[PDB]
Amino acid sequence: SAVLQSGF
Amino acid sequence: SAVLQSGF
Amino acid sequence: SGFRKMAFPSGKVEGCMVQVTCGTTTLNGLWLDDVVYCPRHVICTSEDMLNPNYEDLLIRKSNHNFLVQAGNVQLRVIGHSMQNCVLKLKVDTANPKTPKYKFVRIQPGQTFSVLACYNGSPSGVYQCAMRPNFTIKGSFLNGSAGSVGFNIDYDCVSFCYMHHMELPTGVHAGTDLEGNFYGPFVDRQTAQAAGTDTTITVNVLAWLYAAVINGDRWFLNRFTTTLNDFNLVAMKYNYEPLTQDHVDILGPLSAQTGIAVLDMCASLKELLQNGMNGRTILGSALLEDEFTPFDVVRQCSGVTFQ
Amino acid sequence: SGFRKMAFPSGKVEGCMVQVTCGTTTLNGLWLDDVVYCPRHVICTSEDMLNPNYEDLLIRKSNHNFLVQAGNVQLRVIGHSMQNCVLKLKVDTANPKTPKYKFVRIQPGQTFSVLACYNGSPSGVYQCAMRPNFTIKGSFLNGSAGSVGFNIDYDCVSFCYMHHMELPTGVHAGTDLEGNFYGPFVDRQTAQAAGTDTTITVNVLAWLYAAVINGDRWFLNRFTTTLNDFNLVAMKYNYEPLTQDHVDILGPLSAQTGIAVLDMCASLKELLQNGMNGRTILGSALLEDEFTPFDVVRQCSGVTFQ
């Protein structure tokens, strides 16, 4: 899938 | 030759 | 002499980057005047990201749920709203480092610089091109969403790209600064197909002209061709077809070097069929398509900015 | 994912660039505190450049012969001296945007970013490496002398290069910020030749580790090799021999990927003896040697700077 590249 | 790269 | 993949100086953009946190989700924001722009998926948890309903997610979000940090400076959010795929955070302090800027939507084939950031802090700058399938071949990790692409013209910074996500094939997709995606993509963690990537032919020709300007002439043959005959060969190697408007754009580079565009097309057609036979062009063993005709003129004539 | 030739953010350096004019000769200077650093050949006319007597040429100059501009603001020169091949101009205004900085002399194989400048204004930023023959493969035109190369280390900017001249092969030469040339070159327009440009083997290995990290693994084989046998092959292809120190340096990259350094050497040894079969690695058709092991870690782990 596409991956949303925010951080945690 | 080498060329000194100042400007005019 | 010389030719490098050159990026714009990033100083004017660095002073606009901030960190945006909502819960445990952090990414980068763009702070201009009293507004912070950031990808709207900052409001997601890791579980919301497969099938997010952003209107539902906004119901339990208030101003004080967004934490915005400009380095040591804290910014108080006094409003927020969703505009397409970005959030606009109204903050209590106008950015004193705000440059003269515009929001521009770029088209496939054009280039820009990317300032990759993590936790609102700059990591590096590099130059890329918007691919014909509306992706970019960037360098992004988790936490880089909200990094921006830009051009500089005279005194004005032109923002054209905001980073959101990575596609399974290792390429990247984002929005303009109005929040509208480049290409047929959506901001959710689903399988999404991009179109076939093709080689930007006019850019390859401009880079061949840059080669001649810097003294690389070994690939100039005696042949010429026509637009139709070239495009017949080009379409088989996944090259964008060349049009008459592309020929016109290359005019000044052709006049400067004294090599007619259709003669350069004949040299390109031979490089396609026969390869480079162990030689290199401008230090490259592949044909480079991430320099526009304007990029070449700019680097080879020393254009500077304010 | 992705891997790009990334430069450091240039903002801390853009604020230090000024224009230095002496008579009809102009170049760039570096403004740190109340001192401007620039190449000493600013005091040459066209006639002086074949065999300049810098001591005699400098004794005929006064402070008012140097015009120093920071944008539109003019800075008056209140003192001048020569330190090796660099002039130091004491000015009346200390630069308020002076960053924390260090002067460092680098070694061949190390990388740094260049902010190319003309007339005191930034043109572009790009990454390069000090070649084993003490040149760099840059992009410089007349007027660019005084442009600097730098690394960013947490909060401290490390200046390592100031541009002076171009050699007849299209490669470039300069000094550290104390005025000492890299390599056996002198600042006069005589015939000077660069030595052998060998390939930086430890950098190619780190780049191959970057490829694995990014999913490019087709070149990995089940073979291993010794340092002795690899070096016998590598000396034949003008690669630098590998030492135990290089093995230690690749330690963390080897540990992250699970590929032992000597297994990766066996893979590289095969790529030299057989070529790349038309395949590409990280979008390149040549083995890339301008990324250090630290460059790779910094890009693949998202290291940011203040």
Residue numbers in the entry:
A (entry chain C), B (entry chain D): 2 to 9
C (entry chain A), D (entry chain B): 1 to 306
Give verbatim excerpts from the published study on this entry:
The main protease of SARS-CoV-2 (3CLpro or Mpro) is virally encoded and its precise function is essential for virus replication. Mpro is a cysteine protease that hydrolyses scissile peptide bonds at 11 specific locations, including its own release as the non­structural protein nsp5 (termed autoprocessing), in the polyprotein precursors. Mpro is a homodimer, with each protomer composed of three distinct domains. The catalytic site of Mpro is non­canonical; it has a catalytic Cys145–His41 dyad believed to be assisted by a conserved (catalytic) water molecule, instead of the more common (Ser)Cys–His–Asp(Glu) triads found in other cysteine (and serine) proteases.
Consequently, a Michaelis-like complex structure of SARS-CoV-2 Mpro bound to a discrete peptide substrate remains unidentified. This paper reports a room-temperature X-ray crystal structure of SARS-CoV-2 Mpro C145A mutant (Mpro/C145A) in complex with the octapeptide Ac-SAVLQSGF-CONH2 corresponding to the nsp4/nsp5 autocleavage site (henceforth referred to as Mpro/C145A–substrate), at 2.0 Å resolution and pH 6.5. The octapeptide binds asymmetrically in the Mpro active-site cavity such that the five groups P5–P1 bind to the nonprime substrate-binding subsites S5 through S1 and the three groups P1′–P3′ bind to the prime substrate-binding subsites S1′ through S3′. There are eight hydrogen bonds between the main chains of the peptide substrate and Mpro, which involve residues Thr190, Glu166, His164, Ser144, Gly143 and Thr26. In the catalytic site, P1 Gln is driven into the S1 subsite via a 2.7 Å hydrogen bond to the His163 imidazole and a water-mediated interaction with Asn142, whereas its main-chain carbonyl O atom is centered into the characteristic oxyanion hole [Fig. 2(b)]. The bulky hydrophobic P2 Leu side chain fills its respective hydrophobic S2 subsite, whereas the smaller P4 Ala juts into the shallow S4 pocket capped by the flexible S5 loop. In subsite S1, Glu166 accommodates P1 Gln by moving ∼0.9 Å away from the substrate and simultaneously rotating to form a 2.8 Å hydrogen bond to His172 that is absent in substrate-free Mpro. Meanwhile, the Asn142 side chain flips ∼180° and shifts 2.6 Å from its position in the substrate-free structure to produce water-mediated contacts with P1 Gln. The substrate P2 Leu forms the S2 subsite by a >3 Å steric swing of the Met49 side chain located on the short S2 helix (residues 46–50). Superposition of the substrate complex with the substrate-free Mpro neutron structure reinforces the suggestion that the substrate-free Mpro structure is innately pre-organized to attack the scissile bond upon a substrate-binding event.
